Design a binder for these strands. Structure first.
Ligand SMILES: [Mg+2]
Ligand SMILES: [Mg+2]
Ligand SMILES: [Mg+2]
Ligand SMILES: [Mg+2]
Ligand SMILES: [Mg+2]
Ligand SMILES: [Mg+2]
Ligand SMILES: [Mg+2]
Ligand SMILES: [Mg+2]
Ligand SMILES: [Mg+2]
Ligand SMILES: [Mg+2]
Ligand SMILES: [Mg+2]
Ligand SMILES: [Mg+2]
Ligand SMILES: [Mg+2]
Ligand SMILES: [Mg+2]
Ligand SMILES: [Mg+2]
Ligand SMILES: [Mg+2]
Ligand SMILES: [Mg+2]
Ligand SMILES: [Mg+2]
Ligand SMILES: [Mg+2]
Lengths: 101, 77, 49, 194, 132, 138, 328, 539, 200
RNA sequence: CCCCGAUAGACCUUACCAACCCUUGCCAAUUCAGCCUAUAUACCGCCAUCUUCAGCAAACCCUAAAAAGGAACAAUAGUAAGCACAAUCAUAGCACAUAAAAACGUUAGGUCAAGGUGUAGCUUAUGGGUUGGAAAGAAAUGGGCUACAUUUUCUACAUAA
RNA sequence: ACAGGUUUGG
């Protein structure tokens, strides 16, 4: 299984964002411009709204990989602030040490 | 090592004006598509076929939506 | 792929290569609970029956 | 039934070639090292731990395969693959007169399954404008055409290309940019009269 | 009181290893890192891709060699091939040790799409550093 | 006493294509500790003096990344835990190298490169002029 | 563990032989000077503690030592105070008290014969000799020492010193004296160089609060400063910063006797002034005598300013400012 | 390949043979798990996309199309045969290309089914002759039915289609293996087949001349003349022969060498002419070549040529020339057989520490040659150094090897410099057998003479009393020697028990033991005991 | 969820709660039972749920001179093997149940008058083999500390005597019973009397 | 404790609620999963406090008996491994300072909601999904920013306007 | 009585 149902849903959110990333990337070019008339922009707005909800990368939440904690997770290690300590104080990550200056 | 990018060169990536012939030259369509061409030329992440597919998507979208461009007041083909 | 992780670990455990102490602890605790008399009810007889 | 075999220490010859025992990178197995080494923080009444089962001796990288003897033995056989450097290009003054164009290409290494590094696509081209055949108006036009990429104090034009994915494609784009700039620096159009 | 990676003081009879005998504030001072790679550098990337594979192997080897593994693993990462150094007790027969090392070198390599080396060092018992 | 005989059998051919020349080969080695970097510097110097490379080695400044996290689990913000990541640099400046020499040197270096360090290679590829710039008139 | 010590000696000898062999140096000329470097190179263990690094020295240095034999084969203790607990400390106390009684009787005989040929050797102000410390006494006497016993020994030494000492009594008192670690805190003066027909040339370096400054002074020209190509008056508009530059020159009366060029990097409006002041003070030593250099280093011109900004602490504002601690 | 840890280093040859199989049993087990669960390894992380680390698939792609199922089942025995029926049930016409591979898939793996499939080659569709003999000729040689193979040659000759090299590479063997009181007809037929192979514009390959040579080794001992004639004819063509060609010639020369010692010189000169160039194992039959070229040297006692045979193998490839270790264990053993006694003891000891512990462990044969080499040159300082290794290398052969390792001490003298080793070699042997191992009586005579000149009587007297309780008594010469030792050490109380424990068992030299005890007691002034022993042996 | 699992040692330490904050002064003692059962006690490494006989773990590596291939048991013997495993589980408690008995001095459940053997030899090298010792009293002494509360300490009286008139007694107090007995035996030799015995 | 979980809330986050849907419902399978259900007064993992306080302590010895205690420096029965302190380490040279560290324990202190958990409770629901809302201030209060000016405000500007 | 169990943090 996964860590939590929240993480299971977030995986599907990321998958749907990767699936419909091209369509939104092509449609937003019709809205974020000022050369083309607004008549087609108002239609492109409805078209991109007709897309499924989980297709936008905005619903993607950066959780942890080990415990799927919704907050307090570094972006480089993708680990929670507590699992990162539990591993660093064990010494399974190179270069990490107690800051002493 | 192990990635040849289909043996393409810089003229297949940067110079993409060859795919904008099926568009009105003096209309706003060229003004809109020059930005897409510059963005695709400044994108080392995508290949040539994906940029061709984007150009074709725009072509068929604009060719399917013919009533909106005629209603907007600017004559487009 | 946490699903791949769990499936690989469980298949190895059932084939006799991996020995998951946590899963063995869960199974021992469930065995002791069912021996004591409080197990998992069958689906469909918990509320009505 | 348990069997205890003595290590190689009792069989190591004092004149034995060490690269023969440690040719490549090894995890520092104490069974093949006849040197008694003690690593670790000692005790108030004790001594540093022995080499047997010492985790700190496996934590640290070993250079036992890169002793000076092995370094010389390996570098002696590498004289066949290399070529001779031209002694007529020791000073950079003649190097600039002969090969004025400098091509900076970045290459990175990293341990792991992936090799692709997006920092490797950048290609720099440095050209000294004092080694070309531009005229006065051509140089004055090239300055305003390249903008800030030309250092007036150093008299060097720097073109940093990153638009092409492949490094060879960026190199071709850089040489095309140099060619098209050298060609356009001479064309006097209608707007240059005003 | 700090508890992270710190074993508390018993009556004076428990055997502790050189790693557990040092508080977490001794990393890079007296004890070294159990894992070596490039992801934990300044201008480098792939910090989590190696960390998840490190934790997975920490669990995999612990499940593969149960009761006979003395200390933690040494996970070196050098030029596309990863080395796993282990301190194992000589409880299992050599045939069963070779079976497992040959199974691991062929399973983990195909599971992570990278060459794996597995080095085993047999100790008679857990080496005790402090009081025992 | 029992030494193998006829152990040399390489495949080296001389191609008619002119070898590429290089002005400066910069090697930026980043690591965590200084002992590995010093051993690697000694190894590189020993490998370069045999080949006649005249390597210039200087120590670039270090870079330390520090980050602060909470100390307890649920609610304790006045007490923190700060972690540090050091990065020590070594600059190997090679000059007057050829294509084959640079290839064999980089091979012999990256084959024995340690596990705890990374290396960035910056090459100064020498070239005189392309064909459309020597003396063209539009 | 004598057999263990001998086995470790043999192992160290054979390992040193094999280390010399694998390193390629001559084993006869192979000593600890090469052993340390070879070990540090072959095991590049980068740690913050040198004692935790791998080290292979002689077993007599690795394993600690202890007290020698006190009694022979017959069991009779050698020393006459073995049953006192500290056969060394109490013997030293007894010998000191005996020498004190001897000096007392000698001085009494001299006073009776009306002869005062001794002097007071207690005033050790120009020498800077201090008494031993607990560690300096426990490194001499192998056994441990107590603080009260150390204080008693020091007070007995000062009692003996407060009386006219004899010929060997002076050495007996001074053998338990430790002076300054170097006793030569006087700094070295850079020789006067002459670069490109330029006489009275000197160079100095200064630093204060992350501000590094280098000064090049010529003692032959007029009195002026060149700060990074621009004038000092325009570089330092505040009066304080110009007083910082005038301070080293006014003390030496070299206002219009030295032309200096300063280059400073880092700091603010006062850190740069302090760094240039320190560099100028350290550079002007080549033009003055030793007594004026001593006067400057006593006035603080040749001493750096270790007062730097302290790192901020977690949960605080300026490494000292704590938050509002509410009692309730 | 083995792990350097002492607990995992192989001690004996059987352990070295077992550890590799144990590791491979884990390797192939992990490979089977990967093949059974490919979905756990589909994710690719490596950029170069190494295909060898990808899971394999043993299922076809299409199950409905017969032409698509045949091409997938021919490459992945029973399923390939069932696909043929599944294709023939739908009345589908199969071409001559899929049928060839379908027949080859059966001729590679696999009597009645062979005929049932061979009829499916001609009766259903006229399969090409070029694909018929590549299957039937090679499938019948393992089924031992060559009478049908010769008819296919006539069929392909009548169909005006040429015969390839692989045809004659097997037909000559098929016609040679059948001999019924006639050896000339088959050779004449082989010659008539060669004269037609050279006529049909098909050049004979190396295997063409190798297969005819492989058949002349098991029939006649005088058949070396045509074997050398074809060898010269192949040299006349310009094709350098591989090791498999010379292997059969040296094998026949080794068969003809036992009665006549002349073929050895021919072997040596042809081997010296071959060893001048670096070869490459381009033939899978290049394994027994060295097994024979060193067996001839070990049989005819030529170390000057054993050195050349050893220098030839490590010229191009020291390891790619031998496939199995069954040949290596017999190779190095028979090499050290000559190397122990032929050359100097220094050379023997210098080649011992490099080949015995590292390359391979010796067998029970060379361990006796080591004793012979240490006995012919009177080397005693090496006996305790070789026996400590023999303890680990010959523990399975110790019970059948110990009766010859200890006799070397009684034939030589006992210098007073090796008295500690003389005691250690006896203790490490005797203290281990009494805790379980037939104990030979000759070892007591050695443990007596090792301590006689060493001057240790208290430790030597217990070993004599320990064996007398083993329901076996040694010869009385040992008693007469220990009696001289006791009368020289002045201990008369020990002989009154020896004479009593010998008289009750009636040693054949008891009348001499009774004479020696009298002289001992007269020397030590014990006539009372001399008479008391007679009064005790009387009753 | 494979990363969410932990070590069996931590699992048992969290389950039994031997280091609880309530069991320090004595707020526990309600459920006065603590047992940690080893799960890997009789767990063969090779056997699995599917019953695959690996040539290196379950079955030997070589049979009849040839190697052994990968085989799997049928669904008739693995069940009996699991039944034997359950039998061994239910017998585990029978193995670790035995109290080494000895001779009784005064009553069957006391240490008064029981024998303890000759005392340990002195540091100078003297051995007391002719001496015989007996335990006269055993008592569990408690002390109220500041943190641990009740501090159970064993104090015992031990007498020594050889039988020729030389004898003595001593008191040994320690934490462990085996240590208190040893201390009493070692301290009883230092205090010896001589009893004048008329006609012995 | 009060800019604390949260170094971060339009949907997701979010464990809350209302409307509607699914019940071997993430895994190969399990009369099985899954619960942010209760118990922090069962836990581990992590910490707050005395706390820059130093004390803890196995092995011996002594007491006109010993439950226990063991100290007088012009010294009266105290020695002692190791854990604390100290030293060492880091702020790239010393010293200093800072940083780091601070055992055994008290507060049944905080954390079942980082994560796993024994016990006690759910299985057509206290489980799994979709959509919409999660206000607002009668009132009190903690901590920060702006200031209440002339040592001030604006302008260009290193500080002479 | 040849005695033993039973108070209490002890
Ligand atoms: Mg959970
Ligand atoms: Mg009873
Ligand atoms: Mg606050
Ligand atoms: Mg919401
Ligand atoms: Mg919602
Ligand atoms: Mg819920
Ligand atoms: Mg609590
Ligand atoms: Mg103290
Ligand atoms: Mg006491
Ligand atoms: Mg102590
Ligand atoms: Mg400290
Ligand atoms: Mg320092
Ligand atoms: Mg300090
Ligand atoms: Mg602190
Ligand atoms: Mg509470
Ligand atoms: Mg509170
Ligand atoms: Mg709750
Ligand atoms: Mg939970
Ligand atoms: Mg009472």
């Amino acid at each position: 299984y996964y860590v939590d149902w929240k993480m299971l849903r977030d995986v599907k959110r990321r998958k749907m964002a990767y699936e419909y990333a091209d369509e939104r990337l092509r449609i937003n070019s019709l809205r974020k411009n000022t050369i083309l008339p607004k008549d087609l922009q108002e239609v492109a707005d409805e078209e991109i709204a007709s897309l499924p909800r989980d297709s936008c990368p905005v619903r993607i939440r950066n959780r942890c990989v080990m415990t799927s904690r919704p907050r307090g997770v570094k972006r480089r290690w993708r680990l929670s602030r507590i699992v990162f300590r539990h591993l660093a104080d064990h010494g399974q990550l190179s270069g990490v040490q107690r800051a002493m200056w | 090592a192990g990635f040849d990018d289909d043996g393409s060169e810089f003229h297949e990536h940067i110079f993409l004006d060859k795919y904008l012939q099926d568009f009105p030259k003096q209309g706003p369509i060229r003004h809109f598509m020059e930005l897409v061409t510059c963005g695709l030329s400044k994108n080392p992440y995508l290949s040539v076929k994906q940029k061709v597919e984007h150009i074709e998507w725009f072509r068929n979208y604009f060719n399917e939506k013919r009533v909106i461009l005629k209603e907007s007041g600017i004559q487009l083909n | 792929n946490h699903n791949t992780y769990f499936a690989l670990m469980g298949t190895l455990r059932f084939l006799g290569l991996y020995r998951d102490e946590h899963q063995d602890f869960r199974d021992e605790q469930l065995r002791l609970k069912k021996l004591r008399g409080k197990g998992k009810p069958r689906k469909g007889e918990g509320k009505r029956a | 039934r348990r069997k205890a075999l003595p290590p190689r220490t009792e069989k190591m010859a004092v004149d034995q070639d060490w690269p023969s025992v440690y040719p490549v990178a090894a995890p520092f197995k104490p069974s093949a090292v006849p040197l008694p080494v003690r690593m670790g923080y000692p005790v108030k009444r004790g001594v540093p731990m022995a080499k047997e089962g010492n985790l700190e001796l496996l934590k640290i990288p070993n250079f036992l395969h890169l002793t000076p003897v092995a370094i010389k033995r390996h570098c002696e056989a590498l004289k066949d693959f290399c070529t001779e450097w031209p002694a007529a290009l020791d000073s950079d003054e003649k190097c600039e007169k002969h090969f004025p164009i400098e091509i900076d290409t970045a290459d990175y290494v990293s341990a792991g399954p992936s090799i692709r590094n997006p920092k490797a696509r950048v290609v720099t081209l440095r050209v000294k404008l004092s080694s070309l055949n531009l005229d006065d108006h051509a140089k004055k036009k090239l300055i305003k055409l390249v903008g800030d990429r030309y250092c007036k104090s150093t008299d060097v034009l720097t073109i940093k290309t990153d638009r092409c994915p492949l490094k060879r494609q960026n190199y071709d784009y850089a040489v095309y940019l140099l060619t098209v700039l050298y060609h356009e620096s001479w064309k006097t159009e209608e707007w240059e009269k005003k | 009181k700090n508890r992270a990676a710190r074993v508390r003081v018993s009556k004076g009879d428990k055997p502790v290893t050189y790693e557990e005998a040092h508080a977490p504030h001794y990393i890079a001072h007296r004890k070294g890192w159990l894992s070596l790679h490039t992801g934990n550098l300044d201008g480098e990337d792939h910090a989590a891709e190696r960390t998840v594979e490190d934790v997975f192997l920490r669990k995999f080897m612990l499940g593969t060699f149960p009761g006979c593994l003395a200390d933690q693993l040494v996970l070196k990462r050098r030029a596309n091939q990863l080395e796993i150094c282990a301190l194992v007790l000589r409880q299992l027969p050599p045939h069963k040790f070779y079976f497992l090392v040959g199974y691991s070198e062929t399973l983990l390599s195909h599971f992570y799409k990278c060459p794996v080396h597995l080095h085993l060092q047999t100790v008679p018992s857990k080496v005790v550093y402090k009081y025992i | 006493v029992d030494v193998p005989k006829d152990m040399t059998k390489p495949e080296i051919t001389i191609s008619d294509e002119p070898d590429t020349l290089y002005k400066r080969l910069s090697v930026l080695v980043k690591g965590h500790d200084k002992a590995v970097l010093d051993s690697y510097e000694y190894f590189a110097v020993l490998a370069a003096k045999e080949l006649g490379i005249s390597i210039k080695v200087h120590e670039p400044p270090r870079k330390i990344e520090r980050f602060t996290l909470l100390k307890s689990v649920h609610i304790f913000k006045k007490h923190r835990v700060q972690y540090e990541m050091r990065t020590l640099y070594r600059c190997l400046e090679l000059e007057h190298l050829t294509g084959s020499t640079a290839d064999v040197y980089l091979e012999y270096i990256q084959r024995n490169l340690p596990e705890g360090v990374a290396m960035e290679v910056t090459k100064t590829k020498l070239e005189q002029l392309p064909e459309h710039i020597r003396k063209p008139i539009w | 563990t004598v057999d263990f010590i001998k086995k470790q000696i043999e192992e160290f000898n054979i390992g040193k032989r094999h280390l010399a062999n694998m390193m390629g140096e001559d084993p006869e000329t192979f000593t600890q000077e090469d052993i340390d470097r070879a070990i540090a190179y072959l095991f590049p263990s980068g740690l913050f503690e040198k004692r935790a690094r791998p080290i292979m020295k002689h077993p007599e240095e690795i394993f600690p030592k202890q007290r020698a034999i006190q009694w022979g084969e017959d069991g009779r203790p050698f020393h006459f105070l073995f049953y006192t607990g500290k056969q060394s400390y109490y013997s030293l106390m007894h010998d000191t008290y005996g020498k004190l009684l001897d000096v007392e009787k000698h001085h009494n005989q001299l006073r009776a014969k009306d002869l005062l040929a001794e002097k007071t050797k207690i005033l050790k102000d120009p020498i800077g000799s201090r008494w031993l410390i607990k560690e300096e006494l426990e490194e001499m006497l192998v056994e441990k020492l107590s603080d009260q016993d150390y204080a008693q020994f020091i007070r007995l030494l000062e009692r003996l010193s407060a009386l006219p000492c004899g010929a060997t009594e002076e050495d007996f008192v001074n053998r338990f004296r430790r002076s300054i670690p170097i006793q030569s805190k006087k700094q070295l003066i850079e020789p006067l160089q002459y670069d490109e027909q330029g006489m009275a040339f000197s160079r100095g370096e200064g630093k204060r609060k992350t501000a590094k400054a280098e000064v090049v002074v010529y003692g032959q020209g007029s009195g002026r400063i060149d700060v990074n190509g621009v004038d000092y008056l325009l570089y330092f508009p505040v009066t304080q910063d110009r007083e910082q530059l005038m301070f080293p020159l006014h003390f030496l009366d070299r206002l219009g006797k030295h032309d200096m060029t300063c280059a400073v990097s880092g700091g603010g409006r006062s850190a740069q002034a302090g760094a240039v002041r320190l560099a100028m003070a350290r550079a002007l030593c080549s033009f003055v005598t030793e007594d004026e250099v001593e006067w400057m280093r006593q006035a603080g011109l040749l001493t750096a300013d270790p007062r730097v900004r302290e790192r901020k602490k977690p949960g605080q504002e300026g490494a000292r400012r704590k938050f509002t601690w509410k009692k309730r | 390949v083995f792990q350097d840890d002492p607990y995992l280093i192989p001690t004996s040859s059987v352990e070295s043979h077992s550890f590799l199989l144990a590791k491979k049993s884990g390797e192939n087990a992990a490979k089977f798990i990967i093949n059974s669960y490919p979905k756990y390894f589909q994710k690719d992380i490596a950029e170069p996309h190494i295909p060898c680390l990808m899971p394999e698939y043993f299922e076809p792609q299409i199950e409905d199309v017969s032409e698509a199922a045949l091409q997938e089942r021919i490459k992945l025995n029973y399923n390939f045969q069932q696909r043929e029926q599944s294709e023939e049930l739908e009345e589908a016409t199969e071409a001559d290309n899929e049928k060839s591979k379908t027949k080859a898939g059966h001729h590679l793996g696999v009597t009645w089914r062979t005929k049932n499939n061979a009829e499916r080659i001609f009766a259903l569709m006229p399969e090409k002759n070029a694909h018929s003999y590549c299957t039937m000729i090679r499938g019948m040689v393992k089924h031992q039915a060559p009478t049908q193979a010769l008819n296919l040659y006539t069929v392909l000759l009548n169909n005006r289609l040429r015969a390839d090299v692989y045809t004659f590479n097997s037909l000559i063997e098929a016609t040679a293996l059948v001999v019924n009181e006639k050896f000339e007809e088959k050779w004449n037929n082989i010659l008539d087949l060669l004269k037609q192979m050279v006529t049909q514009n098909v050049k004979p390959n190396l295997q063409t001349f190798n297969t005819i040579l492989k058949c002349l080794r098991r029939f006649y001992a005088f058949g070396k003349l045509p074997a050398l004639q074809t060898l010269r004819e192949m040299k006349a063509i310009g094709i350098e022969p591989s090791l498999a060609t010379y292997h059969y010639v040296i094998q026949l020369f080794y068969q003809h060498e036992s009665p006549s010692k002349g073929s050895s010189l021919i072997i040596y000169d042809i081997m010296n002419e071959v060893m001048g160039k670096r070869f490459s194992p381009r033939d899978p039959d290049d394994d027994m070549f060295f097994q024979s070229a060193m067996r001839v040297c070990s049989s005819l006692r030529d170390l000057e040529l054993a050195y050349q045979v050893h220098g030839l193998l490590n010229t191009g490839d020291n390891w790619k020339l031998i496939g199995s270790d069954h040949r290596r264990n017999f190779y190095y053993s028979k090499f050290f057989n000559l190397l122990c006694f032929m050359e100097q003891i220094d050379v023997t000891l210098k080649w011992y520490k490099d080949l015995i512990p590292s390359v391979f462990f010796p067998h029970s044969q060379t361990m006796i040659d080591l004793l012979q080499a240490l006995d012919v040159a009177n080397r005693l300082d090496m006996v305790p150094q070789i026996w400590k290794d023999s303890k680990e290398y010959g523990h399975t052969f110790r019970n059948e090897l110990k009766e010859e390792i200890l006799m070397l001490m009684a034939r030589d003298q006992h210098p007073p410099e090796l008295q500690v080793a003389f005691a250690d070699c006896a203790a490490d042997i005797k203290s281990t057998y009494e805790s379980q191992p037939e104990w030979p009586a000759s070892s007591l005579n050695y443990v007596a003479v090792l301590f006689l000149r060493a001057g240790r009587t208290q430790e030597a007297w217990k070993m004599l009393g320990l064996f007398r309780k083993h329901n076996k008594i040694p010869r009385a010469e040992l008693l007469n020697e220990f009696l001289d030792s006791a009368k020289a050490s002045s201990s008369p109380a020990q002989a009154i028990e020896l004479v009593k424990l010998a008289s009750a068992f009636s040693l054949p030299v008891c009348e001499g033991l009774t004479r020696r005890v009298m002289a001992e007691f007269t020397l030590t002034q014990e006539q009372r005991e001399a008479l008391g022993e007679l009064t005790a042996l009387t009753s | 969820s494979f990363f969410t699992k932990l070590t069996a040692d931590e699992l048992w330490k969290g389950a039994l709660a031997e280091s609880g904050a309530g069991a320090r002064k004595g707020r526990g003692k309600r459920t006065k039972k603590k047992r940690r059962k080893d799960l890997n006690r009789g767990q063969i490494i090779g056997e699995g749920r599917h019953g695959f006989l690996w040539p290196g773990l379950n079955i030997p590596l070589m049979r009849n001179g040839a190697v052994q291939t990968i085989a799997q048991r049928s669904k008739e013997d693995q069940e009996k093997v699991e039944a034997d495993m359950v039998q061994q589980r239910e017998e585990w408690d029978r193995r670790r149940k035995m109290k080494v008995k000895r001779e009784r001095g005064w009553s069957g459940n006391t240490w008064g008058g029981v024998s303890l053997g000759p005392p340990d030899p002195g540091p100078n090298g003297e051995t007391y083999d002719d001496f015989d010792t007996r335990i006269l009293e055993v008592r569990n002494v408690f002390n109220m500390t500041a943190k641990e509360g009740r501090k159970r300490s064993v104090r015992v009286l031990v007498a020594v005597g050889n039988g020729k008139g030389a004898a003595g007694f001593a008191i040994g107090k320690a934490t462990e019973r085996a240590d208190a007995f040893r201390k009493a035996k070692n301290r009883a030799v230092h205090y010896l009397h001589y009893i004048e015995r008329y006609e012995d």
